[PDB]
Structure formats: structure tokens, C-alpha cells
Subunit: 456 residues, 4 copies
């Protein structure tokens, strides 16, 4: 079915104050037209992020009641360890409080100063930890991933020729690891094929280069393989996930994404040497290796949630709900990154607002307008988030001037997707009336989080 | 709009095993083709009843954690008492474990043998307790309410001429009370207008006749007043509810319906002597007047839920979701009771199965077919539920031979309603294939609960 | 050992406002010196009752999160049914909201007006439902059980000679059933031996007389058998419980006592005809036979709790904690009912206050003093609770003028027992300062619940 | 009084499998005689740590149900921020997943390479982060604090002469900050007086030196001030805590200790530039400044718990329960660190096992014996934990060869303390039977966590 019904019932709800348009305009002005400054209580549908915003199940909430809060030897740790070894196949696990904690560990352990990390695009925290520990990031994604209009499957795939060029020019010994992300967030959540994971493993194996997955949306990725990669139609999500990780030496995972939890992550690896070093290191940043900065109840919820994510109907519905939002927007001509990824729809605010110049902040303006018209919060991922250049004082001009509609798992319905799409379509049909913005408060750093604007 | 989005988010989900048609056919055979015998875990969308099946909010679940389980003086009792007095306006409350416990109390307190209770149709438990304590029930609903095809507003209204006739022929002193139900279940969940409650109170007040509401779906009723009764468009649900009860001397309430809980009810009254007598009586049937057969946590959840029910957008969506299901069925030509009530859609199994006689149990079989083809459970409300006659041994032949699609509050989405409607519409396209049923096991009483059948 | 440590850890706490003595005096005065009028929030240690006040486990709270709230076929019902069948051995179960709901069913099903019910003493709700349905209660406990000073083991045992006399004089066909309570509440919570249950069964079996247990404290009873009955030292609690019920045809249970829950009960029986009649009756008073006036989550919690109650160390500690309180009072010369029962200690307020006459309400005043000095709530079980006579308007003069210290399961510690004992001992050492009370407000009904007093 | 009762009730329990001595011996052997390798499910009373093992209240669990999981603008963040500002008095807060996450931030922000951090002893993670960022740690605690036998109040106090000497010898500009810990863990949990905090602040103010508290047990510290410091007898815990922090420029806090939670921490500061820099840094290690690596529900639980910790009777009981354990051991002549601190009792395993040399691991073996005899887990804090020298490959010979009995808050009773004390006293009476240990597996890293031993 194009748009299957939810393969679950609602067990409990979060109530919403259904405030008026006038009230939303006031709240938006009080937030300086910056959606990052809005209060959660003033938001109907919060699409700021799919990270940690997921609805847990009744079974996960039952697990939340039997947290074994012991510092070592917790039953919840054993459950998480058993589940991750079974489903991902790695020999060892170190829990962390979320994904960036695992990235801190991996990059400290696996990078020597002056080395390169080759990846299919990048994510802010992952790249920070690579660079902080002395690596230079090299993008080896296929060229097509950078073409936001191209409707192509498996746009997250690595170009093996780019990897070959890096090996030839820099030397395999100088590549700390290949960081293969599933899905690829910067391209809109685009999946990587099993064939590509296998090919990257074969080339890396020839040269002794380690591969670590940035695995935060690996289950969404597995769904795309099942749906679209020839031969996988009748392979279970579980068996796809297991095969995916068979082509990796380890992973960093955010449970806040595909493990259906509000907090939690982990680092996996296969060898005793890195496992021993990771256990020593985790103590000072996260906690003992037996909890890694998580309550026992959260190790339990994450173990339960990762197993729930293997249910075909759950992940099919998850991805097809995002697809529905993209389909409704595309039918109305709204400019979006193509094809729709696993977790979000990215609006092209530059094309959405052709009457605004980039220094009038099309993405920031569009996000503000979306909230005022619907109560939907979305994230600016454009010139404002790109920051101001410390050298010239000019704004960095990113290629993507994006508004991100990021969909939490199991929280919203198709009717909520219609609220989102209908309001965006109404804005697009009168796009020339969307007012641009100008800074009235701009901090020197992290400006997306607290900058304030007025209209122009 | 016709079909507003849910005015809430999903906080937690209830897991569903997405079983296949073959499995459902086997489960239905094992249940003897009686949907009442199906296991909950084998059901995707359970529309057996809206009683006690509601999804609570995060706020209600927080209240569930601060149950004050004291036998007397519980904080939760004081919260429930304060909330009910504020919203319903009655002077006194006695909690009960659910509505029929309150009915037991009211009928023991307010009826002496030989008296009459006049009501707008009846409900099984309510009428049982009236008749058990010596009353003769008199139906005073308008004759039009018995016509399942009449698209008339406020079909639950009392015929004031029938009430005047009963007073004249029997004497006001021989009428124990008027039992005014909101909404009216037997007519399909039909509302009563404020003008009708006002007129009934005016006539009753002339003769000193008490009025007690069967109030289980009073919030659904208030919504219909707001939507459809002249002068109430801008009045809040809270203010409508308060005016409704101003025309009564008390009520029996099932929190399991419009208080958004899974258990709980209460008896309200203004009269001091009745209150003291109720408190003495409740001890032996329910518990002390300070908890009434409920855990403290459930008094808390019911207090919170009743207040949540006052949110306009919540109850508008609740009723319009039921209406959506009826609209989709009607647009496809499926025969249903009209107009759609607040809580359920009733299929007319006579017209759905014109190849079957009523003695071949078309409602029972239609319910079985719906489950086998969709995973949706519905309730037989026809010849099987009516039972067979004691003196003649023959089955009763109720005018209404229906299948009830009863919608729990805050549990399902419009996509779930589409599963229900699409499956019923598909069955209707080949309705001649629905096979008649015959008893293979028939208990002497309560036969609908456990009877088993096979195809003819 | 005499006083084992708690065989559990504290998972969560209920905070207490440790109000000062001056504040407690003000609260007691606002309650008119009636502890039943105190607010729970003003009480440190609430020994009003062991009914429904128990602390659940983490595992029970996990069960509370997987309530299957379906009207029929709930997984929680199946769990409860399976557990009770395994542990009690009866063929059939009908859930009820608490014990008095099951007593209503049993008494309506198993009694004809004018018949006799023979039992080992009585309890208020149980005897009401027997007499309301036309039975005459006959006490067949041993005369020694009525001697509150006598340190007799198995004080709850039925006198087989009194049962034989009833059979011979009235005829077995005129005995509706024998009601055997385990333990016996009116004597202070006293156990019945396995030999006695066996002998009652053998005699009833000869004459075809049915036996139904009032099983509310059957696990406390099983502990006394294991501790004190020859040959049972090495038999598990579970095997003792199973053998106990092998000597009955059914039981009524309040889960609020030994099933470690805050709400819940059930009726068990072996007979198919009675099971069918119970199911017809439960519908109008409690709910369908598939939930019986309980939420699914509560059927789950009760199933889990009954199994937890079988842990030897739990029930040993439960009973020995009550015994500790009795021992500390006895060691200080405080007059108490003997021997200490499974769930409560009874102070003899007549001997505690020899300077007061019964018409000066020594039990009521002693309970008030206990609260003022410690923050402990206890229950008057004397002249005030006995009420004012129907015919003469004079106070009843009960032989037992007592204050009940009733201990919830898993809520308090030995240090709390010391707060209770130390405060009572201190009062005893200046008992002449306890002032008599007189009514200032006396309702006609349920006077113990709301009467108010002042000092003479 | 010496040993007040728990100023709370039990709301829920964690059940325990009450296994036999023979079973515990087998489990201890399976764990290689290392208590860190025991399974939580096999432990009756787990005194491994007071970190994150606390029992939350019903009110905290209610907060756990209303987690606002929004990435920014969560209601739970605002509650935590408001509560911490009110109670600790600092202008700004950055949540962190636990204390060591806040230490990472503080040390990166406040230390330039080569600077000194002066502290009253040290904690492993806190000192790691100081040294990792280029500081040299200098101990400025009073020399008497290193005398484990000395019964002296406020043994955690800084020696003002040592602070003055450091300032004179190194220069104020070369002191990054004074790290004042409350209480002082390495001395056994010893408190710091208000007079000392005030004097340290005055001296630092003269030279412009910043003070940051390591505040994990600040409420235990406040209790000792109230109990023992001149002028504080009648000052509330809340007002003592507020005054303590008035002598600091910020703090690192572990909610896992005195905020009565299982996870959570935070960084506080007054300086705006440091706050802005901390928010930049938290993004990459913990999460956005609006959640800091915590679920919303945990920010809520920590806010509620910190307020609960202010209740005088709670913290009095907390500290006096630990004191009771120390008193019972001292009365029997068992050698312990003196005086007892706020959170733990430390056994002197050197004196407990005079027949063993330190290279035979007496603390490790004593911890194993305690578990085998009682089911109590304790932590080795001696030669094994001290590790093997970095340069010579020899074991360190720490002066303190201790076994730590660390008491979680609100989890255990005095009867549990008696299980602990009675078992240790019984072991002490035949201490010569405790066998020495030798390594069978010694990891090169983090050896205390996974080393395995056998008897010599
Ligand atoms: C979420 C995200 C991360 C970081 O995980 P957190 O749990 O948020 O720290 C890393 N990589 C990608 C691709 C992500 O989307
Ligand atoms: C549900 C119902 C009742 C009985 O309430 P319960 O809580 O189920 O006992 C009474 N009247 C009407 C109209 C009902 O729908
Ligand atoms: C508690 C009690 C009852 C009644 O049970 P409830 O659950 O309180 O209705 C019946 N018999 C005895 C002996 C009791 O103690
Ligand atoms: C607990 C502890 C810490 C570290 O806090 P965590 O929350 O465990 O990271 C820092 N200092 C002291 C003194 C501690 O006891």
C-alpha cells in the first residue's frame, strides 16, 4: 500500500493547547522569529528533530519500571548487550549516553594526528570529533548525492573511485577509517545499498582500512534496501540489518534515532584491543562500561526499542509517512530535496522564496512563517546555521538553504502530515507575501540557537 | 473543517502483531465465529466498545504515579470531588468503581416498589437496577428516535407529551424519577438538546418530580449542542456541560466513557439526605465513601480526564472521527443507522445481508466476516444479543439487527478508520458471500458472551 | 530469626510532611478528635487498614504499563485466570473490583432465604451480604477464640462439634454453605490449621455441604501453618496454599489484602452451574466476566502480586513485623489482644484507660492521643463504631473496646514500628492523662466516619 | 534522636531472590572473587556505590510521566533551571548527563596549560579533566584529613595557610581555580564548614581567583553544618545550601548523588562569557544546552529530587543511617575510617586482615568474604583499584587499603544495616580465616573492573 495505516494503537497522548493564529504570531515575535527559541508548550507539531522525540511503546514503558540501577552487573545492561550483539553482530558494546558520546570515544581511539577520515558526507558532531582528534575529513559520496533535484535510489552510496583516489594520493596507512553513514543525513536521509557496503568493505579490506558505521538511521536504511534493492524484497529487516553491519568493523549508534528512545547510544567494535581501550576511556567521559552514562531503565528501553524497530510494518509505515508528506508537497510544486529520505523532508527555501535574497534569510523566514500559519516547528538549516565567517565577517553562503521537516517516530499521524503540508502549500501559493528577516540580536557563536530577528 | 487532525500527539503506542488473513480465519474459527470470544492480542482495531478502552494522557499517567492509597482522606478523592463539583455543579459525590455501581446506589435510594421511571430509551444495567428495586420503566423518547433512517438532529429528545401523559395517568407521586440519558445509546448515540433538558426540567419542577441523568456520554452530548443548537456556537463545552446538569437533581456517571479513563464512575446528587443514605449504602457494595471501589490513582486519573474532556478541539475531533467513518460508509452505499452518534457507527446487517434471514444471525456473521477480512472487532447488536423468549422458546426478533463499530477515545487515527471502512466496503461489494450461522453451543443466559456457531 | 530484615529493597518512596506536634494537635482538633477525619497528607504512619494500602513491586508496576484494556479477551485476564488456577486450584474465576463484590455474587448465588451460613466468626461486609440474601449466620468457631487474653494457636479453627450439632439439628440440606475465613479478622487475624480445613472438608463431604473460603488473608494463614503446624515446616508456602484450597469448593478473595495490590478481588468456584450463574450476575454489579470491574492493568498487578506473596521470606517478614510490634508492646505491659494476628495489633483501650468509662469513648480518645503524639493513625473499634441502638437510642456496649493498629504490606519498617510502639508506651506510662471524649457532632448514619468530639 | 525512623513510606519495592550461602559462594567464584563482576540480581544489599542507586519518590515518578522530550524549549528544562537557580543561587545552568560531563566542560573552559587547580583532596574524574586540560593539581586540605583514625569535625576543610602559600609561590594568575569539594570523598565523605567556605572565598576574592565547587554531596555537607557548626543549629538546610554556594563562582553537580536521581548532572556558573562558551562546548559532548544529554523526564526528576533533598528529616535520616552502621561496627571493634562521613563507611582491610600482606589483596578478599557471608556487595578501594605503576610495573601500596560500604539514598533500612554490620562483625571474630588472593587474569587497563582472582 502507498500509505499504510499505523501498525500500532495509541496507548497514551500528549495534550496540546490549540492556540490561535494571533497567539502564535505573538509567540513567534516573542521568540524573535527564531523557531529554536519557541517553547515546546506553544507548539502543536514539533518537527525540529527526529532525535530523542520518539514515542515509546507500552512494552518499553514496562521496561522503564524495572530499571536495575546497579553500577555494574545490571540486568538492563545484559539485555542491551545481548540484543545489540544479536541484531548488529558486533562482538562488543560500550553504552554511551547518546551518539556523540560514542563518536567522542571512537575518534579518540581510532585517529592519529595527520590522518584522514573518508565518509559519505558528514554530520556536525561526527565531523567535530574526527577533526578534534586530528583527522581531515574527505567526502567520498557519489557526485549525485549533491544534486538535490535528482530522483535516484541509494543516493548515499560511496563512489569507489573517490576512495581509490584518496588511497592512491594519501596512502592507506594515513586513512584512520572510512566513516560510512546510514542513512546520509546531509543529502536528506538518503540510503546506502548493500552492494555499496559490500564493495566498500572489499576495497577497504584489500588495503587494511577500518570501516566504522555512523549507524543512527540504519533501520530506515534497511527498509530502503528491502523496498528497492533487487533480491532483498523477501529478506527480513532483521537479516538486512545484520548483513549491513557484517561489512563494518564497528559503529557509533544513537538510540535517539532508530532505537525508538528518548536518550541512549552505544559504540560497537569486534576486537579486544579497541574494546579494552574504549572501556578505559568511557569511564572519564560517560561512566563505567556497565552503564555508559545511562540509567538502567534506559538501557532496557533502548534494548526493547531496537528490537521493535525490526518489525517490517513499523519501519515501512515510518518511511511511508515521511514519503506521504513529500508526495503532498511535490504534488503542489513545492521545492523539496529528492527523493524523500527516511526521516525528514527538506524544503528548498531559496526556491520557495525567490523574492528574498540569501542575506534576508529565506530558510529562517520560511520556518517562522510555517509556525505562524500552523503551529508546526521546523528547523532552519541554511545561511543562519552556516554562521558568519570569522575571517571576513561575511555570512557563509551554503549551497543548501533548507528548512527541515524532521519527523519523530510514532508521534504523529497522516492528519498531522496534512496540517504540515496544507500550511506549507498555502504559503507556497502566496510565497511573494512571505517577509524576509534581518538580525536584531546575533551572538558570536551558535547563532542559530539564540539569534533574534525582525521582518523586512 | 469536516475532519480536523488529532489535537494531541502520540506519547506512547500499544504494540500490535500484524497477523495475516489465514491466522485471523483460524482465530475466528477457534472463537466459534463469535467476536466476543476473540483474544485481544489477535485484534488490530478493537471496536467492540468505547467503554474503558480510552487512551489516557501523559498528565493522567503522572496522576497514576501519585495515588494516595489511604482508606480515608486521600488527596485523590479531594481532587475528584473538587473537579466534579466545579464541572457538573452538584453538591455531593460518591465515587463508584464504574457507572453500574452508581446505578445500583441510585435505584436503591430513589425507587420504591410500584413506582415508574420514565426515560429516553434505556440501557441494560440502568434498567436492570431500576426494575430490580421495583420500578416499571416507561419510554418517553420521541417516536421518531426509533426510525434508524431519519437524519434528524437531537434524536435523543424526550417527547414532553408522553411525559405529560404519564404524569396525568399515573400521578407525579408515583414517578420515582425521570432518567434522562445523554447521549441516547439505543438510538445510536443520539444527543439531547439543551432546550429539551430545560423543558423537561420545567415540567418536572411543576410536579416536584426528580430528574437524574445517565450521563456517561455527556461531553459528546455537549459537543452536539455546541455544533448544532442555536445559541451555543460560541459557548464553551465546559459551560454547556454546566448548564446541562443545572436541569438535574443528580447523575450516574461512567468515567469509562467521557472521563477518558479505563475504570471509574460516580454518583452525584444535591440532596443532603440522599447523600448520607448513599454513603451508608456504598460501604457494602463498593467501599467507603472516600474511595468507592477505586484506587486513589484512579480517582486522580478520572479527575484529570474529565477536565481534559472539556477541551473543545478534543471532543470535536472525537465526534468528527466517528462521523468520518460513517461518511465513508455512506458514500459507498453501506447501510448504517442515521445520523451518526457520538461514539459509534451501526451497520444495518439486515440490508447488508439481504440473502440471510434474521434467524441465520446476519449481524453475528457480518461481525465475524469483518474480523476475518480486516482484523477489526465489532459487536453484534441483534438477534443473538436479544436472547430467546422464556415462554415461547423462540428467539426475539429485534427491529435493529446491527453490528456496532464502537470507537474508543484517543486510540485510533483516520487511517485506522480507513482500514475499517475500506474493509467493510469491500465486503459489501460481495455481500452475498457472507454465510449464515447456526448455534453449536448456546448458554442459557448471556448467550452473546460465549455462544459458538458454525456456518449453515 | 525473630525479626528478619526486609527481603526486598525500596524502589520508590512516598514523601511525608514531618509536621510538628503542635501542628498535629491542630489537625487532630480540626478532625474533632476522630482519626477517620484526618487527611492522608497529615499522617506519617497510617495504620487505619491493611486493605488496599500495600506497596507494589517494580514488577507489578511494569505490569501496570501493559494493561490490555479490551472489554473481552484481555491478556491480563488470561494471566490472572492462569495464575489463580495454578496457585489456588479452582476450576473457574470471576474477577470483581474487590472482595465485597465477590461476596455479593456468592451470597446471591449460594443462599436461599431462611437458610444458615456457618462460619468461624464474621466480618462486616461478608455477614451483610449473607443476611441481605436471607441467611442466618451461625458462629461455629471454638469458644476459646472469643477469649481475647488467651494465647491459643490456630484460634481461627472451626469447632467440628458445633458444625456436627448444626448438621444434626437443622439438616445438611438447610446449610447453604460453610464460610471458612483465613485468617479470622474479628479475633485479631488468627489462623486456621490445615488439619481443621481437612476435618471440615471430610465432614461436609459426607453430608454434601458446600465450603467456600473467605480467603482475603490466605497467605498469612499459610505462613502460620508452615511455622506452627506439625509436618509443614519444610512444605513451601505455595504447596500449603494449594492444599488449603483443595478442601474448599470455591472462595471469595480481596486482592487488596494478600495479593499485594491497591484494588482487585475475585470469586473462584469448581462447579460449572455456579460459574454460569456467577457470570450472569457479575454483569449487572461489576462488569463483564472478562474484567469484573477492574482495569486490565489491575488484573495484571493482582496476578503478579499473588505470585509474589508466595515467597516464603516475604510472608515470614510480613507476619514477623506485625509480631515485633506486638512483642514490643507486650514487653512494656501494654494491654493487647493475644496472640498477635497476621496483619494487626489490637490495643485494649478499656484496660489502657481504666479511669474512663466506655461512654467516655476510651478507644476513640486513645486513637486521637496516638496520632497527636506520633503522627500514627489507628482505628477506633469500640463503642463509637458499634453505633447507637436501633430501638432504644442507647449506645451499644461492645465487649471489645479496642484501637486497631493495622499494618499494610511492604510499606513500613521496624523503625516505623518503633515510632508506633514508643509513642504508645509513653502514653501508657501516663495513661491517666488521656481525657474522655463526648460527642459534639453525631450523624445518624456511619457515625464512626464523621462524628466529632471534644474532651470532657 | 540518635537513629530516627525513615521520614517517608515505601511506595514500591524491588524484590530480592534470597539465595543461600552455598549459592553465593558459587556466584563469587564465578565472578573470580571480584565483587565488580557479580550480577545485580544475585545481590541482596548492593553497597558498591551511592551514585545513581537512589530511590526516587512518587512525585519524581509522576514527573517521569510528563517528560517533554522537545529538543529545545522543554518545560522540564525550565523547571530544572528555575529550581537550581532558586536553591543554588547561580545565574546560569548547563545540564549534563552526569557530573563528569560537567567536569569536562568546566576544565576545558577554565584551565590554561600549566595553571594550577587547588583542591581539598581529589576525585578521579574531576582530577582527570583538570590534568587533561593542562593543570597541575595541588592538595590544600588540612593535614589532619589524611589521619584516618582522627575523630575531628569538618575534616574536609581547606588549610588556609596552604592556600596562601600556593598563591604566594605560584601567583594568583597561575591558579585556574580552587576546586572545593563538598563533602570530601577521599577522606571518607568528610564535610567542609561554612566558616571555611567563607574564608576561602574571601582570600580568593582578594586575588581574583575563581572558585568552583565539586558539589555532588553538598546536601550531606549542609546537614553536618546544621548539626555541628556553631550558629547553624536553627538554620534550614535550604538556607545552608544557598549560603554554601554563595561562596563559589559555579559548580559541577552530580544529580546521581544528592539530587536523589539515577542519572543527571549540571554545570552552574555566574559569568556570562563562560556560560556562552559552555553552551558552545556542551553541544558536541553532551547535547544542546536545552537538554545536555538528558531526557526531559530526567531534567524533571532531578529538579524534583533536589527540592526533596532540602527536607531536614530526609537528610538527617540519610546521614544518621550511615552513622548507625559505623556505630555498630565501632562498638564491636571493627576498624573503620573515622569519623563516619555522609554516604559511606570504609573498613580498614589492613587491620581487618593482619595475617595478609597488601600484595595478597586484603580489601579485595574482604569484599568477597562479605558477599559470601551476607549477600552484601561492597567496593575494593585499595591496592587493586590503585593500579600498577606506570614506570616500574610494580603495584602501588596505598596507605588506605579499604572496603567501601556505600549507602544509596532511601533504598535500605536499619534492618539492612544490621545484616551488613552483623555479618562483618561475625567475619571479624574469625578474621584469620579470610584467604589471600592472587591474580589469575589482570587486564592492563581498568583492572579493578574485570580482574579475576583465586585464593592463595
Ligand atoms: C543524530 C546524529 C548523530 C549524533 O547522535 P546523537 O545521539 O544526537 O548524539 C550522529 N550522526 C548522525 C548522522 C546523526 O543524525
Ligand atoms: C456504559 C453505560 C452505562 C454503564 O456504565 P459502566 O461504567 O459500563 O458500568 C450506563 N448507561 C449507559 C448509556 C452506558 O453507555
Ligand atoms: C477486607 C475483608 C473483606 C472485604 O474485602 P474488600 O476487598 O475490602 O471488599 C472480607 N472479609 C475479610 C475477612 C476482610 O478482611
Ligand atoms: C560522583 C563524583 C563525581 C562524578 O560525578 P558523576 O555523576 O558520577 O559523573 C565527582 N566528584 C565526586 C566527589 C564524586 O563523588
Amino acid at each position: 500500500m502507498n500509505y499504510p495505516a499505523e501498525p500500532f494503537r495509541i496507548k497514551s497522548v500528549e495534550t496540546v493547547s490549540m492556540i490561535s493564529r494571533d497567539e502564535r504570531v505573538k509567540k513567534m515575535q516573542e521568540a524573535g522569529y527564531n523557531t529554536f527559541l519557541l517553547n515546546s508548550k506553544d507548539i502543536y507539531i514539533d518537527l525540529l528533530t527526529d532525535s530523542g522525540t520518539n514515542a515509546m511503546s507500552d512494552k518499553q514503558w514496562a521496561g522503564m519500571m524495572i530499571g536495575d540501577e546497579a553500577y555494574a552487573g545490571s540486568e538492563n545492561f545484559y539485555h542491551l548487550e545481548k540484543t545489540v550483539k544479536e541484531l548488529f553482530g558486533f562482538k562488543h558494546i560500550v553504552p554511551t549516553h547518546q551518539g556523540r558520546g560514542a563518536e567522542n570515544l571512537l575518534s579518540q581511539l581510532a585517529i592519529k594526528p595527520g590522518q584522514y577520515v573518508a565518509g559519505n558526507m558528514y554530520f556536525t558532531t561526527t565531523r567535530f570529533h574526527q577533526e578534534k582528534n586530528g583527522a581531515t575529513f574527505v567526502d567520498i559520496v557519489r557526485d549525485e548525492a549533491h544534486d538535490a533535484s535528482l530522483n535516484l535510489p541509494f543516493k548515499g552510496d560511496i563512489d569507489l573511485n573517490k576512495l581509490a583516489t584518496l588511497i592512491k594520493e594519501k596512502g592507506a596507512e594515513n586513512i584512520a577509517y572510512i566513516c560510512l553513514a546510514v542513512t546520509v543525513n546531509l543529502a536528506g536521509g538518503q540510503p546506502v545499498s548493500m552492494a555499496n557496503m559490500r564493495a566498500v568493505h572489499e576495497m577497504a579490506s584489500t588495503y587494511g582500512i577500518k570501516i566504522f558505521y555512523d549507524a543512527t538511521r540504519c533501520v530506515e536504511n534497511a527498509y530502503f534496501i528491502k523496498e528497492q534493492e533487487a533480491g532483498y524484497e523477501n529478506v527480513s529487516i532483521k537479516d538486512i540489518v545484520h548483513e549491513m553491519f557484517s561489512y563494518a568493523d564497528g559503529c557509533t549508534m544513537s538510540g535517539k534515532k532508530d532505537c525508538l528512545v528518548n536518550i541512549g547510544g552505544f559504540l560497537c567494535m569486534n576486537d579486544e584491543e579497541m574494546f579494552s581501550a574504549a572501556k578505559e576511556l568511557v569511564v572519564v567521559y560517560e561512566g563505567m562500561p556497565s552503564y555508559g552514562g545511562l540509567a538502567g531503565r534506559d538501557m532496557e528501553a533502548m534494548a526493547i526499542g531496537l528490537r521493535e524497530a525490526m518489525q517490517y510494518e513499523y519501519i515501512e509505515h515510518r518511511v511511508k509517512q515521511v514519503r506521504y508528506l513529500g508526495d503532498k508537497l511535490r504534488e503542489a510544486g513545492v521545492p523539496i530535496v529528492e527523493p524523500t529520505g527516511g526521516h525528514a523532508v527538506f524544503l528548498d527555501a531559496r526556491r520557495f522564496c525567490p523574492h528574498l535574497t540569501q542575506d534576508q534569510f529565506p530558510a529562517q523566514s520560511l520556518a517562522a512563517s510555517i509556525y505562524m500559519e500552523t503551529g508546526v516547528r521546523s528547523m532552519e538549516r541554511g545561511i543562519v546555521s552556516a554562521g558568519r565567517s570569522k575571517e571576513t565577517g561575511e555570512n557563509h553562503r551554503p549551497k543548501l538553504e533548507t528548512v527541515r521537516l524532521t519527523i519523530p517516530r510514532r508521534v504523529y499521524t497522516y492528519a498531522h502530515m496534512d496540517v504540515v503540508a496544507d500550511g506549507i502549500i498555502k504559503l507556497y501559493q502566496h510565497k511573494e507575501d512571505i517577509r524576509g528577516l534581518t538580525f536584531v540580536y546575533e551572538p558570536k557563536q551558535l547563532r542559530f540557537f539564540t539569534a533574534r530577528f525582525d521582518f523586512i
